[PDB]
Design a protein around this ligand. Structure first.
Ligand SMILES: [Zn+2]
Lengths: 166, 268, 45
């Protein structure tokens, strides 16, 4: 996990647990201990600027991989990246997990682009509860104007009337 | 049917009612050893067929010793209903037909009384006198159908090509390595079935545990730690704290690495 | 900061140092650095 984050090829705890059969609690404890050791080694020897590499969320790096797993087009992937970037400004959903934020942004852009993939299929692909995806979409429905990328509706490739209501 | 031979004790009288000797008076039965192509062989050798029904009629013309087989119309219309029986060997020697049947197990000069002989109820039921091969007749209206079938044998291919996945490659590779989905299969969940068993034990009083140990040593003298632990449900520390007091471990005997009762309590 | 053209969609892009070297319009990862703006001298022989 540290290597992925340092290479900006960051995976999630669910990915590393799918690889290695490891308990979550002592995985987190080991990650915290090794981050402390690595910071101590950096302070003792050569100093490195983090510039947002060890950050726990890293939600922009999970969008292209999840969009590839769902078979989404590049413009849908870019719009999902923009939506995930703009979800940080929203106070109520910024506390959610980065996986959940990325998945609900991807599902919102899927509904925006009329991609025929259901929320159950998105949940089965990305191991997220369908109720969680639906709740995230129903709470991001209020902030439609800020999340959806403006020159997309300026060029008319998508419209905000396409998203189903709550 | 497992059995041992070279029995001079004559146990076969008691362990087989049927005689072991080869049954022979049917050996004068005349049998024709007939070879078939695969369509007739598949129609005539499958066990879901052959209920004693008539399958054809044999005509023997003595002008040139010509044998013709004429099948009935009940089986199929694509196959011919007239074949010639070519006598590959008019005189066949040293060829017989015998049947093998299970027996009734219920109710120099140096020799060894063990051969590992498997006896079976055998019976020579015929003598092969004519080796014959079946040929479809040239003038039949289905000989061209047989030629077409035999051409189809070398024409058709029994193997299909590899299936190419036309789905998006990202959707194909979503299952691979780094993946969100946890493995829902329960194949070799040995850790899952082993970690669910937890043995938790209370500290019974010393008089009770020593009474139980003395009863179990009276039951059987030598004990191992795991067996006595699953018999007593006690912690290792307290179990050793009583076992060193009233027992000792064997270190050099054939029953080593086992806790046995002390020789003072052995006579009691 | 510097001028690039995508491989197959022929889109013009401006890249700095911290920017990832990818196309922003079609997602392609192959970009060609632009032809220089200065006049280039060739003898006609
Ligand atoms: Zn491009």
């Amino acid at each position: 996990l540290i290597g992925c984050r340092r290479a900006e090829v960051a995976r999630t705890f669910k990915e590393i647990q799918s690889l290695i059969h490891v308990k979550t609690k002592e995985f987190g404890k080991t990650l915290n201990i090794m981050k402390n050791i690595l910071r101590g080694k950096s302070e003792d020897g050569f100093l490195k600027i983090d510039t947002d590499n060890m950050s726990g969320a890293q939600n922009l790096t999970y969008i292209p991989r999840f969009c590839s797993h769902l078979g989404l087009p590049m413009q849908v992937t870019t719009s999902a990246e923009y939506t995930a970037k703009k979800c940080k400004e929203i106070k109520e959903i910024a506390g959610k997990s980065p996986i959940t934020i990325a998945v609900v942004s991807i599902y919102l852009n899927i509904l925006l682009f009329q991609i025929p993939i259901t929320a159950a299929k998105v949940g089965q692909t990305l191991q997220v509860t369908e109720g969680t995806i639906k709740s995230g979409y129903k709470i991001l429905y209020e902030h439609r104007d800020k999340l959806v990328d403006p020159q997309l509706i300026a060029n008319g490739v998508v419209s905000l009337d396409n998203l189903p209501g709550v | 049917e497992v059995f041992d031979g070279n029995d001079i004790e004559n146990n076969e009288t008691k362990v087989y009612e049927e005689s072991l000797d080869l049954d022979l008076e049917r050996s004068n039965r005349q049998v024709w050893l007939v070879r078939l192509p695969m369509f007739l062989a598949e129609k005539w050798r499958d066990r879901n067929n052959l209920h004693g029904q008539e399958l054809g009629k044999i005509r023997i013309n003595k002008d040139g010793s010509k044998i013709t087989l004429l099948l009935n119309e009940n089986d199929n219309d694509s196959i011919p209903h007239e074949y010639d029986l070519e006598l590959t060997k008019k005189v066949v020697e040293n060829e017989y037909v015998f049947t093998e049947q299970n027996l009734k197990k219920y109710q120099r000069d140096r020799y060894i009384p063990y051969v590992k002989t498997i006896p079976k109820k055998t019976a020579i039921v015929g003598t092969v006198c004519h080796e014959c091969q079946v040929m479809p007749s040239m003038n039949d209206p289905n000989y061209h159908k047989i030629v077409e079938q035999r051409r189809n044998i070398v024409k058709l291919n029994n193997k299909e090509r590899i299936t190419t996945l036309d789905e998006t490659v990202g959707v194909t590779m979503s299952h691979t390595g780094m993946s969100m989905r946890s493995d829902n299969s329960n194949f070799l969940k040995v850790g899952r079935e082993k970690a669910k068993s937890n043995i938790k034990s209370i500290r019974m009083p010393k008089k009770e545990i020593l009474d139980y140990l003395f009863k179990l040593f009276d039951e059987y003298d030598y004990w191992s730690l795991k067996g006595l632990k699953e018999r007593t449900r006690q912690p290792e520390a307290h179990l050793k704290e009583c076992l060193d007091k009233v027992a000792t471990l064997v270190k050099k005997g054939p029953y080593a690495f086992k806790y046995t009762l002390r020789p003072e309590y052995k006579k009691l | 900061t510097l001028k690039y053209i995508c491989a197959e969609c022929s889109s013009k892009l401006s890249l700095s140092r911290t920017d990832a070297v990818r196309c922003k319009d079609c997602g392609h990862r192959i970009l060609l650095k632009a032809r220089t703006k200065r006049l280039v001298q060739f003898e006609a022989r």
